[PDB]
Amino acid sequence: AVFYKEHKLRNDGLVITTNQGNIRLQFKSEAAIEVLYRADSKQLPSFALAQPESAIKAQLTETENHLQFSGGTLTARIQKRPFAISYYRDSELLLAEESGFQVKINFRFYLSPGEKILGGGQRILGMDRRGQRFPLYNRAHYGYSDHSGQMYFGLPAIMSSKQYILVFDNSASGAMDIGKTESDILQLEAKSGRSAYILVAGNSYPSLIENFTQVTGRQPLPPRWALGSFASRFGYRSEAETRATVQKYKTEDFPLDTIVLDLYWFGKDIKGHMGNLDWDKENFPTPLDMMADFKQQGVKTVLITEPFVLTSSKRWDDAVKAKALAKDPQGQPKAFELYFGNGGIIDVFSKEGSRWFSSIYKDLSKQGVAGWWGDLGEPEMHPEDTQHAIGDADTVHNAYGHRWAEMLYQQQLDQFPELRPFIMMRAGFVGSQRYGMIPWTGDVSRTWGGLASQVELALQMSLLGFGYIHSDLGGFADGETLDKEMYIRWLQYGVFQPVYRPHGQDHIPSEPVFQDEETKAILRPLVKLRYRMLPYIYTAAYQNTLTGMPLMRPLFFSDEKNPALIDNKTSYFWGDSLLVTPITQAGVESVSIPAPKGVWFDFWKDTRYQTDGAPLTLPTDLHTIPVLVKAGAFMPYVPAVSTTEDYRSDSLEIHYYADASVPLAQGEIFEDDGKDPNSIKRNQFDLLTLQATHTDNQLHFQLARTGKGYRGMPERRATTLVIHNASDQYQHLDINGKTIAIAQADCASTPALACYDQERRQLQLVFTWGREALNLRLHK
Numbered sequence: 001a002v003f004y005k006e007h008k009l010r011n012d013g014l015v016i017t018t019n020q021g022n023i024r025l026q027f028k029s030e031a032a033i034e035v036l037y038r039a040d041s042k043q044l045p046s047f048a049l050a051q052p053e054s055a056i057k058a059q060l061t062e063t064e065n066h067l068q069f070s071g072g073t074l075t076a077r078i079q080k081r082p083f084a085i086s087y088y089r090d091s092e093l094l095l096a097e098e099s100g101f102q103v104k105i106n107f108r109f110y111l112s113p114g115e116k117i118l119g120g121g122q123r124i125l126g127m128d129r130r131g132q133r134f135p136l137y138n139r140a141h142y143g144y145s146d147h148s149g150q151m152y153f154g155l156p157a158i159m160s161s162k163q164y165i166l167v168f169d170n171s172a173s174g175a176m177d178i179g180k181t182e183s184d185i186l187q188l189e190a191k192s193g194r195s196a197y198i199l200v201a202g203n204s205y206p207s208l209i210e211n212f213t214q215v216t217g218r219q220p221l222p223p224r225w226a227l228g229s230f231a232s233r234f235g236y237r238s239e240a241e242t243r244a245t246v247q248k249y250k251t252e253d254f255p256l257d258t259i260v261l262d263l264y265w266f267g268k269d270i271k272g273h274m275g276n277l278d279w280d281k282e283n284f285p286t287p288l289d290m291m292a293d294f295k296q297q298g299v300k301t302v303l304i305t306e307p308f309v310l311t312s313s314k315r316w317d318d319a320v321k322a323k324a325l326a327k328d329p330q331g332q333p334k335a336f337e338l339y340f341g342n343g344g345i346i347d348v349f350s351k352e353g354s355r356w357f358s359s360i361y362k363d364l365s366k367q368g369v370a371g372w373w374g375d376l377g378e379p380e381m382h383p384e385d386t387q388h389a390i391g392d393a394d395t396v397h398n399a400y401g402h403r404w405a406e407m408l409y410q411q412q413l414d415q416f417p418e419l420r421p422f423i424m425m426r427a428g429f430v431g432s433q434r435y436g437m438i439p440w441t442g443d444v445s446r447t448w449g450g451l452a453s454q455v456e457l458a459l460q461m462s463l464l465g466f467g468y469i470h471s472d473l474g475g476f477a478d479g480e481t482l483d484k485e486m487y488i489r490w491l492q493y494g495v496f497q498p499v500y501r502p503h504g505q506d507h508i509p510s511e512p513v514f515q516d517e518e519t520k521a522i523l524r525p526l527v528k529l530r531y532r533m534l535p536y537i538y539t540a541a542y543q544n545t546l547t548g549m550p551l552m553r554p555l556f557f558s559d560e561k562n563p564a565l566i567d568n569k570t571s572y573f574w575g576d577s578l579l580v581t582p583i584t585q586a587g588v589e590s591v592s593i594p595a596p597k598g599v600w601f602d603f604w605k606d607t608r609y610q611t612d613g614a615p616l617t618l619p620t621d622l623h624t625i626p627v628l629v630k631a632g633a634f635m636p637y638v639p640a641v642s643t644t645e646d647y648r649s650d651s652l653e654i655h656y657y658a659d660a661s662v663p664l665a666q667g668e669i670f671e672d673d674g675k676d677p678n679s680i681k682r683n684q685f686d687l688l689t690l691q692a693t694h695t696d697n698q699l700h701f702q703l704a705r706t707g708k709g710y711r712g713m714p715e716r717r718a719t720t721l722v723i724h725n726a727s728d729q730y731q732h733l734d735i736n737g738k739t740i741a742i743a744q745a746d747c748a749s750t751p752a753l754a755c756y757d758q759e760r761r762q763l764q765l766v767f768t769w770g771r772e773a774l775n776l777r778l779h780k
């Protein structure tokens, strides 16, 4: 029983008083509002908000039974009696409180009939999580396959088919009930922590995500090397074995940017060494030489680190002395029994813990470490009586990984202000992307079911801020012998998802270079393709940094007025132009692809398909997975390199998928030095744009470059433009007004500047793309 009492304004912030206390409403933007209940009282701070203390001028109108607090896009309508806030985009009702807040923390809201609800982060439950209830408590799900209610990286957030996102801005042990218990109620609970939610609206799923990342944080562009090939296993046992793996990528002619060292780098056993955070010199005798030798070959070294310091580790006494570990209520170091032994947890919420841990990361980075892997940040074990500087384990649990990332990100920026941090972690919070967190889906089983779940997990995380969500390619957990077909399908899919990191327990090889001749003959040209496609992938990365647009986009983006598409977790967009359908079972001979209506091409075979809605049936082979290209796509390639350290776009090859159904099309290629964290902010980039105009008698391309450029940027790029499905009726090409005849023979066999291959329906134009605008005009 709750009712309006009064309200004031304070720094664009509405402070409402009910019978039961204060509520602070602040627009963080024109489409996003923070609703803090118990505003009078001391709470944990926001974790989700990039700018917690921000609030923008909103307009306030008081009526008889209601208030209205509007930002521009988003309207909070505050019914006085009974007390209930609802939320409008213009006058479209998004979300209405039921009971709203009840004081354990509780929030209740109505669900509309037929409303579909994505969210919760990593679960394997179906894309629409409506009808589900699950905890908000980051926890391991070792060896998961085709089902999970609770894994490494939950998010206290949802995305509705009404096109809002709701965030429960609370770090504590909790639960989400999505109209499970009560068909028409969504309920958020926590045992403790901040009593705050955040509503974000958009006109579309893309502008919703732009709105969400605006207020929760934009991922800084990762180093281009994060888009390369990783050598990883659990785990390289020695310097010799690590050097032998880098050598195996060289002798097997697979691309390699980064080798990842698991927990044997700091001790000879799985158990009893964690917290050493220093080289096991018996097995890694010359690590500085090792990292420098790798850097000469363009290969980066990434080291695993964990929150736990064992009482058996060389750093126990020092960590206790420095007060770096979390404490019991008595005030001693909290020790508890992990798989690895008895130990404590570094308190990343404390000054002493942050400085102690930071200092260790600084020393190892100085020795030559390029990037960082933080495993077990759930935290994996976190007894309820553990005491952090700001709260107990159950209150801070879901933000530990978040703050660990922040700590490590700040540290890397202060040591190397001219480099982009690489921070790979298993657990974080809403907004962790702003600290460059790159998550993976943990200890997935080596099963088809484990593979079949990855698109669902990736889209669920991508939709709520995590563009670089990926899987251990090939699978991680148990098995006794390689499932070759599964492995191949997993590393094919890998090419078309964010981070190319095969990884698994080392009783079965995870790295493609250790596979049989057939497997290498299939995967080698696909790992090269990943590198040739860097201009496509790096451009999707750039768009992610700009707008939060995830690299993997769900099928439902193709038609926002067809909510039935929301259920799809078998087909997704890799950037704007590729519809990928991974094969997730053995012996599949053909697939039915629910391609949006329009024209589509087989990425592998150039075959043209049109559909008015009917799905497309494509046969399958072991060599590839089904990928369709959207008519109007510009697919840019550079020559394959072994390492992104050698990346050049002096030679470009661009494939344009022509069809009269697409009279207007645009592409862009974002180029910078691949390393400068300030490139976008300072416009130290080369942004190539291509526009196609396709009419009955003409096909016109406009090429341009913006940005201030960057050191080593090519002035002039040798460009091969390959036009797929080109009309056989074009006779003349103008290039900036200069007329060139189109050859109709021997295109593959002459240094032709314009040649039509009649057999392939491909028109090839070869030219110089310099800094000035270029127009190419084909006419019948």
Ligand SMILES: *[C@H]1[C@H](O)[C@@H](O)[C@H](O)[C@@H](CO)[C@@H]1NS(=O)(=O)O
Residues within 6 Å of the ligand: 142, 233, 234, 262, 263, 304, 375, 376, 426, 442, 443, 476, 503
């Ligand atoms: C953490 C992580 O999920 C996995 O990739 C890693 O190889 C191991 C060992 O460091 C960790 N999982 S654990 O074996 O369950 O500890």
Ligand SMILES: O=C([O-])C(=O)[O-]
Residues within 6 Å of the ligand: 659, 660, 696, 726, 727, 728, 729
């Ligand atoms: O697309 C065209 O213009 C054609 O097919 O000739």
